[PDB]
Design a protein around this nucleic acid. Structure first.
Ligand SMILES: *C[C@@H]1C(=O)C2CCN1CC2
Ligand SMILES: *C[C@@H]1C(=O)C2CCN1CC2
Ligand SMILES: *C[C@@H]1C(=O)C2CCN1CC2
Ligand SMILES: *C[C@@H]1C(=O)C2CCN1CC2
Ligand SMILES: C[C@H]1C(=O)C2CCN1CC2
Ligand SMILES: C[C@H]1C(=O)C2CCN1CC2
Ligand SMILES: [Zn+2]
Ligand SMILES: [Zn+2]
Lengths: 190, 190
DNA sequence: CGGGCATGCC
DNA sequence: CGGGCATGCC
């Protein structure tokens, strides 16, 4: 009945974890600082191999309680101003994948983007998905300065939740500057 | 052949001049500082009475040479987020008038808004048009921090130019602050 | 690149 | 209200 997706970490029976200029990641804040329309690799780590047909879904949610029930969408300006697959209303794109699906949920109206889970090749320890955020956090008529989380869910082909992780995202012009400011504020005022 | 409207002051044979918290006007800068979607009265002054059927047209133009040939439009966000007469692409509206016309020029693509010239009633010395700017100067995908001029033209019913005046506009959140900053910068660095 | 400005907002 | 913050940009 809820149209608000869960954000609670569930690393699950497969031991699902995420792994991480243009962008910088803060472990202390569990927060990515990146620039708009520049791809950000996110690593998928598992302790046990997921079943064939496992899928990886990404969905944004507003972090603040007062905004959590509002669907995160691309702002009207960047909707108007395009890879031929992503609907222009979607904030999060996946690059570098031939089986990307974009979902507009018919009941919750939430956007998500899904790709097949590919196990690491023999010799490799993780797999990478190239995400792209098509607005700044500040975009008027879109995120409008409200922080988001990206929720990454590992799902089997039947729809079962296998694992869930999330990280906060700030899409901004100056990731290094803004990261330093936020880490300093955490230490001084958090 | 030109699609760039003239901005040169032409007070003309009728002695046409303009006359002038929510907003403040700087004579030194010939510049209105106002807030978005809040009406701004502009006074029309004439030395001689224009003929019956005279019209008053308002049109925005970018002030900077590198932007002058781009049509000034409402940004996509405020286009989407409405008095039932103004097309949502138009930046400048007129309130308080029953004969407002909105023009999208079929050749130049420029927007303008026109009302009848009404002579001041017996006892009055000027007439007022209530303009409304539907974006901030800063709006992404619209003016995008580029200053505009508003060009007010007094035209007879045949289309003859009777007079022309202009003023710069900054639509902003804090007109009083921004006016003081710009006047100070004129004195210190102009 | 990075310090400072420009500007909606707290 | 007004000083200060938040943030794309110079
Ligand atoms: C944005 C940065 C990078 O360069 C890679 C991918 C995402 N983060 C962490 C590692
Ligand atoms: C995490 C994995 C690896 O083991 C190497 C380096 C980064 N990714 C892809 C290959
Ligand atoms: C914005 C201010 C006002 O209060 C009136 C109309 C426009 N300016 C000058 C006078
Ligand atoms: C300029 C005119 C006048 O003479 C009075 C005061 C302001 N407007 C309208 C009436
Ligand atoms: C802050 C941001 C900028 O404004 C440029 C480009 C990348 N960052 C440093 C210099
Ligand atoms: C600057 C602007 C604001 O932020 C509020 C409203 C009007 N001005 C003063 C206080
Ligand atoms: Zn945007
Ligand atoms: Zn706007």
């Amino acid at each position: 009945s809820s149209s608000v997706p869960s954000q609670k970490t569930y690393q699950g029976s497969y031991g699902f974890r995420l792994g991480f200029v243009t962008c910088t990641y803060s472990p202390a804040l569990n927060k990515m600082f990146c620039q708009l329309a520049k791809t950000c690799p996110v690593q998928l780590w598992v302790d046990s191999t997921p079943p064939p047909g496992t899928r990886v879904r990404a969905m944004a949610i507003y972090k603040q309680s007062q905004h959590m029930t509002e669907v995160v969408r691309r702002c009207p300006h960047h909707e108007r101003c395009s890879d031929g697959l992503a609907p222009p209303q979607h904030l999060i794109r996946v690059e570098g994948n031939l089986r990307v699906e974009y979902l507009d949920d018919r009941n919750t109206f939430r956007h998500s983007v899904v790709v097949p889970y590919e196990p690491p090749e023999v010799g490799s320890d993780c797999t990478t998905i190239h995400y792209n955020y098509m607005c700044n956090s500040s975009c008027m008529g879109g995120m409008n300065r409200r922080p988001i989380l990206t929720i990454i869910t590992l799902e089997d082909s039947s729809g079962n939740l296998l694992g869930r992780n999330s990280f906060e995202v700030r899409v901004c012009a100056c990731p290094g500057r803004d990261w330093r400011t936020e880490e300093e504020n955490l230490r001084k005022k958090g």
